[PDB]
Amino acid sequence: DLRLHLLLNTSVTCNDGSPAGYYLKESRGSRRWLLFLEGGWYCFNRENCDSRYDTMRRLMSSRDWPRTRTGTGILSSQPEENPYWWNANMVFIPYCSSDVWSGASSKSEKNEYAFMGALIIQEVVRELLGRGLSGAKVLLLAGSSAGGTGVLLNVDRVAEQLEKLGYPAIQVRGLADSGWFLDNKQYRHTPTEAIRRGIRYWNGVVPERCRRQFQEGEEWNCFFGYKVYPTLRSPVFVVQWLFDEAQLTVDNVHLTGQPVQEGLRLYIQNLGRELRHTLKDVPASFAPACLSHEIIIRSHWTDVQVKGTSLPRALHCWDRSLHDKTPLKGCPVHLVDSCPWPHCNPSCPTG
Numbered sequence: 001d002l003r004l005h006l007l008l009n010t011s012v013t014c015n016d017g018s019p020a021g022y023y024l025k026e027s028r029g030s031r032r033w034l035l036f037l038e039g040g041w042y043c044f045n046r047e048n049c050d051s052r053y054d055t056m057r058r059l060m061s062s063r064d065w066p067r068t069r070t071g072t073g074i075l076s077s078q079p080e081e082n083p084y085w086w087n088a089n090m091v092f093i094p095y096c097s098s099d100v101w102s103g104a105s106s107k108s109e110k111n112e113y114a115f116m117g118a119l120i121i122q123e124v125v126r127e128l129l130g131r132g133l134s135g136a137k138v139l140l141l142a143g144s145s146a147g148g149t150g151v152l153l154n155v156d157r158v159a160e161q162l163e164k165l166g167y168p169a170i171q172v173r174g175l176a177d178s179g180w181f182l183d184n185k186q187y188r189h190t191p192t193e194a195i196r197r198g199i200r201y202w203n204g205v206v207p208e209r210c211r212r213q214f215q216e217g218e219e220w221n222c223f224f225g226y227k228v229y230p231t232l233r234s235p236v237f238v239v240q241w242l243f244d245e246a247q248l249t250v251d252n253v254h255l256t257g258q259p260v261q262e263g264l265r266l267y268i269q270n271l272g273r274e275l276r277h278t279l280k281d282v283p284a285s286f287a288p289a290c291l292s293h294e295i296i297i298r299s300h301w302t303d304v305q306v307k308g309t310s311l312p313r314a315l316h317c318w319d320r321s322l323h324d325k326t327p328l329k330g331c332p333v334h335l336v337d338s339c340p341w342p343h344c345n346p347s348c349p350t351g
């Protein structure tokens with residue numbers, strides 16, 4: 001139900017130089033716009049990107065993209081599947097830059113690949129302004145996994161872009177799903193170095209205030225939610241499993257079958273405690289104590305609850321809290337599990 005539009009500025013490209021693009025379903029009776037950033041890891045050097053080009057080419061090229069995609073979860077237009085924003089204008093931005101949405105580098109005689117994630121977002125926004133975004137009241141920049149980190153890296157730049165273009169009435173907000181990572185110690189050794197190298201390979205850019213804090217050579221710090229979030233001006237709602245599977249993968253943890261012994265038990269409990277600590281001062285957040293790779297464009301995203309409140313409800317409460325900072329009776333926005341082990345929340349996805 002979302003239709004593909006390749007960017008009219010064909011100099012804003014996927015990794016292989018094919019045009020980037022977006023899928024759009026308009027809702028003419030709505031001034032809400034949801035722009036969703038797809039995830040899918042990243043690649044950080046020629047050989048690693050060449051491998052990704054062989055077997056994950058849709059994440060590097062638009063050449064094989066389908067003409068349409070079905071909106072699911074928060075991108076669904078059915079109220080039963082999407083109690084939160086079913087009537088919004090829906091935009092799905094495919095991830096084809098492999099740069100955690102940070103890149104600003106074109107293909108050239110010096111560069112086999114283009115890493116243009118940050119420019120893709122800017123160009124999608126600019127082209128949508130002529131398709132009705134100019135009349136928006138709220139632009140929610142959402143994303144999952146690498147797209148969630150992409151929200152943190154780009155939401156304030158979208159806000160600044162709209163201000164400079166002359167649209168100060170559009171309220172830009174962020175929804176970062178599964179992109180809030182910890183630069184922690186691995187459970188067993190042999191990841192943040194890949195981000196350091198990636199930023200150089202991609203000509204990656206980070207938000208200005210965060211860049212000014214960490215300074216030259218240390219921009220990798222701004223890929224970590226707990227470091228970049230306090231520098232952001234736009235309202236950002238953070239969704240994060242306490243035991244995210246991608247976090248565990250980079251930590252070299254593989255929970256498969258046999259009894260967990262003391263060292264790994266302590267490691268996992270400490271990970272959840274650390275994650276919960278980083279969210280203590282994040283007033284809009286939803287952080288269930290689950291081991292999951294599941295994301296908010298999944299059809300059953302309504303099922304999980306923290307303290308009896310679902311994510312669509314929490315997001316609705318967030319909308320109410322941003323009406324023109326007293327908390328709302330029965331409508332919470334800060335929902336972080338306190339129980340210390342995966343699936344101690346009974347509503348965790350079963351897989």
Ligand SMILES: Cc1cc(C(=O)O)c(C)n1-c1cccc(Cl)c1
Binds near residue numbers: 181
């Ligand atoms: C930046 C990023 C994106 C993704 C992803 O799963 O999409 C991951 C695991 N990271 C990450 C990269 C290095 C270290 C850490 Cl903790 C996290």
Ligand SMILES: *[C@@H]1O[C@H](CO)[C@@H](O)[C@H](O)[C@H]1NC(C)=O
Binds near residue numbers: 009011
């Ligand atoms: C196309 O995008 C590039 C990179 O963002 C920009 O430099 C250029 O001005 C754009 N061209 C047009 C015609 O807008």
